[PDB]
Structures are given as structure tokens and as C-alpha cells.
Ligand binder design. Structure first.
Ligand code: N5B
Length: 279
């Protein structure tokens, strides 16, 4: 854009290139993303919450779309890589999960889904805050994209997925912060689906009614037994493992909502620590 002075290139997203920019008039530092869609994006400008990255403006010029966002100094992916030797302390993991669930509860109450939650679109500041970026952009529009945080209902071909997909994604991220390794690191749709099955057990009509009738379900899927959560996410306590299991329930209807997750005993001693950020 003409009104913005590009500082540097942040990275490459799912829709386009993300830039760090400065407004020539106001002097504000922003994040500029270069991409019926116009109306859906304009609805997200009103979706404001302290845990949702603020969409400042929507610029439509020369058949190209520019999305102006609030700037945050680091993403969760880079923060995880920078804390891989010592580990992100548990009180900070709990704070992050609590704040992200608050942001999810807000958007979900307004019927807005993320659909593509990953450590890369979770942004953090020096104040101990964590924010969700690119919310609702999947409904508006539609490099290898990661399947690691994708819910099984999406992998099994369900066209009409719910808010429960974001809970699954956040549960995979929760597990990753604790273990310092991706929960389900799939490199294909079937590898993703089979890694889920190997850990949580191949779903049947008992744990998930209607799973055998799903578009991409195949009766030939190998039958693996469920592994205990104590083996999946050590040294996470009983409260955390219980919340994780409810966030990772196969059936989208049994899967805990963001609002109910905020009331879970794991958040009894939740606080808001300040992270160690070297920018
Ligand atoms: O992504 C970063 N910043 C950012 C991105 C965003 C919006 C465009 C979604 N706001 N702030 C970032 C990551 C690492 C280092 C510096 C900046």
C-alpha cells in the first residue's frame, strides 16, 4: 500500500505475505497482510477482544485486498523453539491456555470459527498476553500447510464442522507446550489421521456415534488401542491431563466447549506471569 512504509518481511502465511509496516500519518506500527469476502472480513472488524489480534482496517484497492492488523512482537512457534531446552514454565502454559480459551469463548459465542489454529498464529507480547490471529479468515476465503492441529472430523471429510475444531487444535498446542514436541506431526492426511488413531485409539460407534458413516471413513482402517494420557503428556498433572482428554474427545459433541473448559479445576490456581522475551 501507498500509505504504509514497509519495515521488514515477517513471513509467509496461508493467504499471503505478512509485513511489518509503519503508517506515514499516524506513526503506528502495524502488521500488513496482502491477500462476499469483503462483507465477511468487515464483520471481523467488530469482533474485538483482548485475546484476539485487532483487525485495524480492511483496504480494497486494485482488485487486491490488504488487511491491517495490530502488531505483536513474537509468535508462539518461535517462543517454543526459543524455550526448547528449559521448557515454558507450567504457570505460563496455564496462563496462555486460559487466555486462548477466553478468546475462543468470545468468537464461538458470535458463531465465528478459526478452523486453522496453529502456534504460528498465536501472538505474544511482553505483558504476558497471548492473542489469536487470522480469526474467521477461513470462512471468508477458503508452501505446505500444517495438518498437525487438524480435528479428525475435518480429516474424515465432514463439510459442516463446528466450534469443536478449534478446541481440538488448542488441545494439540497445549500438549505441545508441555512436551516440547508436536502431538500429532503428520505429513499427509492419512499419516495425520493414523497418528491420532495410534495414540487415542481408532474410533468406533461407541466413542463416536456416526463415525463409520463419515465421507472419508474406511472400514479397512487398522484398529489400534488407546494409549493412556500419562504416557502421552508427562509430567503434566492429573488436572491438566483431564482437561486435555476432554479437549481431545473424538466426538465433536462430547468435546468440551471453550466456556466449560474455563471452569475446569486446572485453572483454579491460574495467574498471569511475565515471559522472558528477547526481541
Ligand atoms: O507475526 C508477527 N507479528 C504480528 C502478526 C500480526 C497479524 C498479521 C496477523 N500482528 N503481529 C511476528 C512474529 C515473529 C517476530 C516478529 C513479529
Amino acid at each position: 500500500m501507498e500509505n504504509f512504509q514497509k519495515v521488514e518481511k515477517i513471513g509467509e502465511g496461508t493467504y499471503g505475505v505478512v509485513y511489518k509496516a509503519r503508517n506515514k500519518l499516524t506513526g503506528e506500527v502495524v502488521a500488513l497482510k496482502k491477500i462476499t469476502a469483503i462483507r465477511e472480513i468487515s464483520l471481523l472488524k467488530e469482533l474485538n477482544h483482548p485475546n484476539i489480534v485487532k483487525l485495524l482496517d480492511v483496504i480494497h484497492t486494485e482488485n487486491k485486498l490488504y488487511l491491517v492488523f495490530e502488531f505483536l512482537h513474537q509468535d508462539l512457534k518461535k517462543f517454543m523453539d526459543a524455550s526448547a531446552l528449559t521448557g515454558i514454565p507450567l504457570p505460563l502454559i496455564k496462563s496462555y491456555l486460559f487466555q486462548l480459551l477466553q478468546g475462543l469463548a468470545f468468537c464461538h459465542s458470535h458463531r465465528v470459527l478459526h478452523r486453522d489454529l496453529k502456534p504460528q498464529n498465536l501472538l505474544i507480547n511482553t505483558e504476558g498476553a497471548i492473542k489469536l490471529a487470522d480469526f474467521g479468515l477461513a470462512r471468508a476465503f477458503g508452501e505446505v500447510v500444517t495438518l498437525w492441529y487438524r480435528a479428525p472430523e475435518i480429516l474424515l471429510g465432514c463439510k459442516y464442522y463446528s466450534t469443536a475444531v478449534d478446541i481440538w487444535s488448542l488441545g494439540c498446542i497445549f500438549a505441545e507446550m508441555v512436551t516440547r514436541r508436536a502431538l500429532f506431526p503428520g505429513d499427509s492426511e492419512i499419516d495425520q489421521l493414523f497418528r491420532i488413531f495410534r495414540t487415542l485409539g481408532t474410533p468406533d460407534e461407541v466413542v463416536w456415534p456416526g463415525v463409520t458413516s463419515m465421507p472419508d471413513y474406511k472400514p479397512s482402517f487398522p484398529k489400534w488401542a488407546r494409549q493412556d494420557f500419562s504416557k502421552v503428556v508427562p509430567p503434566l498433572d492429573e488436572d491438566g491431563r483431564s482437561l486435555l482428554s476432554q479437549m481431545l474427545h473424538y466426538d465433536p459433541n462430547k468435546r468440551i466447549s471453550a466456556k466449560a473448559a474455563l471452569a475446569h479445576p486446572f485453572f483454579q490456581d491460574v495467574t498471569k506471569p511475565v515471559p522472558h522475551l528477547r526481541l
